[PDB]
Amino acid sequence: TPKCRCTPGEACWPDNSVWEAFDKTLGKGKLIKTSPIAQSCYDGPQKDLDRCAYVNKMWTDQDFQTSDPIGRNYPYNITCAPVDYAAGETPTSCILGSLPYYAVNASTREDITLTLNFAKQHNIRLVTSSTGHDLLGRSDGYGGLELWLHSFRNGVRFQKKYTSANKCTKSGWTGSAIHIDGAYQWRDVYTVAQANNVIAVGGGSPSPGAIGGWPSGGGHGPATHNFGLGADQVLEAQIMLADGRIVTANHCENSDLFRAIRGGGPGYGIVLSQHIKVHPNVKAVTAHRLAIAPRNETAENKDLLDAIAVLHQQLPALSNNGVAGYGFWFRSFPGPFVGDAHSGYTHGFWTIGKRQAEAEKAVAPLMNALKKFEDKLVITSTFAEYQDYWSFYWAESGLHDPVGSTSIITSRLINPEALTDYNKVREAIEVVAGKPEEVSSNVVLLVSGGQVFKDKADTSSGLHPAWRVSPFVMISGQGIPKVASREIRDYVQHQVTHVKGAALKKLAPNTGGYMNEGDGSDPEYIDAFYGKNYAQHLAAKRKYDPDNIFFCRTCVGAEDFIERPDGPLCRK
Ligand SMILES: Cc1cc2nc3c(=O)[nH]c(=O)nc-3n(C[C@H](O)[C@H](O)[C@H](O)COP(=O)(O)OP(=O)(O)OC[C@H]3O[C@@H](n4cnc5c(N)ncnc54)[C@H](O)[C@@H]3O)c2cc1C
Ligand SMILES: *[C@@H]1O[C@H](CO)[C@@H](O[C@@H]2O[C@H](CO)[C@@H](O)[C@H](O)[C@H]2NC(C)=O)[C@H](O)[C@H]1NC(C)=O
Ligand SMILES: *[C@@H]1O[C@H](CO)[C@@H](O)[C@H](O)[C@H]1NC(C)=O
């Protein structure tokens, strides 16, 4: 049976009549022949400068990118760039690249069954997308048939008391739940949680999918320190296997599959629905806004980075005190970042469940450590109190930031013991700060600790062990030009993987990274992404998808195949 999937233009590729008959079986209009988002910017039959300008204007918008079957928030390889003609830009070339060639706009189980079956029947690579949010190309594939789940939406329903499809009691959970009965986004789930005065533990941005890559890789957000990571919210799922069977996965049934999807990434089956734990609303949340800038701005920014190193050392104490959230910093920035300075550190942290007085005590270990820098840095610190989770969430989080660039980042979970020696930390900070000429994004995800640590007791979970000891994640990355030569991308990828990523590993060598926002070019990605759970993830992969119908890049088992950006996917 053939080692390589069939691709367009080959003799094995179904001819126009076969595709047309497949469109008609589905329901005319469901099969979409994909077109590069910005093809109207280029010469040929599809050229349209009005369409091109609209596309150029809307490229950075998350909804615009989720609305097209091959729209990508963080496109893995821009092979058809939008062209800004008003700005004097001119076209190079436009190809599909590694984006799927056909998509099925699937809105019923029958759509999904037929798409799965057709892919297998014609040996065509099946690509699964709920939203196209992925940063690593795991919802892409050259010459692929995309199962697009964006309109597969059969309700989001609140359960006052979790009620399992197979009456499983082994979760031990008798609290409330939400049945996410479709490939909904967090926005949709949040509306129902809010209507029912409960906390749904979703992402900091509401556009990503609720039941796909987000929970399967981990899933962080404002509420995860307090209530657990996204993967650990999952009580059960309905999943269509490669063989077409629809099965329940929970503590009582196919528990190896259930564990795999809760931390082992995508590619075990097509997730049709999940049930998630939801949590009682709180009476208070206080947010802490901190900003730090140099009094004396220089290319080295020695004092700023000293303080950032110190701040990193304070995070575990903060985490132990119920503090969570996100911090952002730059050694150099192309313009004012903190007040008047073209550099600095800023964060939005919070104590869910605590009023301001307790919030101030919670961050005291950090503010006290920062008193030593009052002569050297300008530091501002404010608190905002909210009377429930949702007013807090929408005020301090619920982000819809600009997107549309390639992601080249590395992530490293940091254990407390990696931070006790200031000099080692300072050295890590020096390297990840990057070259003063090159913009380096550095981000702190203070999203673990607390309940995430506690949920180590849950052996049904598949989450990377390092989550259970690491209260926060460091992410460091750089951009590439929109139209990027191979040489420039290899230079940047090397800085991210072997300079930035390497420093982070040296700082914390016993932990790992975060697959969803992580380094897909790391030679050691298996270790980073999955850790010691990998052998068990792989077993589930080989049991439930022996033919690797759900192949994705870096996903468990992907090393048994060779992916190309411009040719057939093949088994080794
Ligand atoms: C603007 C933006 C903001 C973000 N914010 C956050 C954040 O705050 N916190 C955080 O942790 N992450 C965040 N992410 C990252 C997100 O967790 C990952 O990109 C994740 O892969 C998104 O899953 P998705 O289904 O939405 O993406 P997709 O690209 O649709 O799919 C991602 C992967 O999951 C697979 N997949 C999707 N749906 C299914 C399914 N139903 N069954 C089987 N496999 C499936 C795909 O095959 C692919 O491998 C953000 C991403 C974007 C674009
Ligand atoms: C982005 O897409 C381009 C175009 O498909 C890829 O370039 C090809 O890469 C292979 C090696 O992997 C070469 O043998 C081809 O000659 C390249 N083609 C062209 C037209 O340049 C590129 O590899 C993709 N980048 C990534 C990181 O996936
Ligand atoms: C996808 O299908 C739904 C109906 O199931 C329809 O409302 C929607 O507009 C379709 N989208 C596209 C892009 O064809």
Numbering used by the authors: 27 to 598
Sentences from the paper on this structure:
In the present study we report the discovery and the structural characterization of two novel flavoprotein oxidases from the thermophilic fungus M. thermophila. VAO-type proteins are composed of a FAD-binding domain and substrate domain. In both MtVAO615 and MtVAO713 the cofactor FAD is covalently tethered to the protein by covalent linkages.
